[PDB]
Amino acid sequence: VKVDEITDTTAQLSWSYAVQARTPFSVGWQSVRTVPEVIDGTHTATVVELNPWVEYEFRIVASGGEPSLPSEKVRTEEAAPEIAPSEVSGGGGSRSELVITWDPVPEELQNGGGFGYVVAFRPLGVTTWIQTVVPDNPRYVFRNESIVPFSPYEVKVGVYNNKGEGPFSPVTTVFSAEEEPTVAPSHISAHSLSSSEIEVSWNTIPWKLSNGHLLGYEVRYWNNGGSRKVKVAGNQTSAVLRGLKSNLAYYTAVRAYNSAGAGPFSATVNATTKK
């Protein structure tokens, strides 16, 4: 059972015959296709439709007779990769960033050494791509002062390896990191509801296109003697602090946040629980 010729998708073996095969990635042995498709009681044949740059063992079977000892561990020849990555997306991040992401391409599908990704991006409605090389962290961050906050980018990710280039993902749309809120909620107030609950109210903060999506408001509170925080949805504009101690003052202040961070805190106000 010897392997002589060897390519990226074919191997030549010599020894009714069937061929099994085994790789790091296969689960044990499986049949493989051959030339000839059928092997008449012919003492060589051609294993085909193999994966490039993948280590192989082969055994031969006559029939349901007892299988052969495996061949020497051989690795197939390399080739350009042929599968683009999936779930290309991204967004989020610190000011002046653009964050791009994708699911990683399996090692069996990389087809060679020196594998990596090409990340291509441009502001929506621009002609010049910027394409750069990155693994195995399937995340790319572009940093530049000039990046306009929360702008759409066209983004595609491709693959390559030492033997050449592979497909690109389809073009999809990704927004750059947003600018953080710069201002604080006006006219915050606080009244006691009971000896255990304080309600805090504030006003809607101005919001710009560059601020992206308002994730919510963070309410911080504390006392004196013996600190915490409650987050609240973005439509919400009010909050009840529960589980408080009786007859005691709390202080509190709010700020809005988005994916890029929090704005200044409002004024610090105070109310006192009953009893």
CA distance 144 to 187: 36
Q: What is the resolution of this structure in A?
A: 2.8
18 occurs within a structural domain: yes
Q: Tell me: do 95 and 152 sit in the same domain.
A: yes
d(C-alpha 178, C-alpha 185), whole Å = 19
Claim to verify: residue 126 and residue 72 sit in the same structural domain: no
Tokens of 264: 């200044």
Domain boundary among 48, 76, 104: 76
The torsion defined by the Cα of 110, 114, 115 and 118, in degrees rounded to 10, comes to -150
Question: Helix, strand, or coil here: 61?
Answer: strand
| Inter-residue contact 181 to 210 (CB < 8 Å) | no
Domain that holds residue 22: 2-76
Rounded to whole angstroms, the Cα distance separating 106 from 116 reads 11
- Are 100 and 149 in a shared domain? yes
Residues 24 and 105 placed together within one structural domain of the fold: no
Q: Is residue 182 part of a domain?
A: no
How many domains does one find in the chain?
Answer: 3
In 3D, which of 42, 41, 39, 45 has the Cα closest to residue 10? 45
Q: Do 105 and 155 fall into the same domain? A: yes
Final residue before a domain boundary, out of 134, 151, 176 = 176
* Tokens encoding 99: 């964050």
CATH of the domain at 248: 2.60.40.10
Domain-located, residue 183: no
Residue 121 forms part of a structural domain: yes
List C-alpha distances in Å: 211 to 39, 97, 151: 68, 14, 10
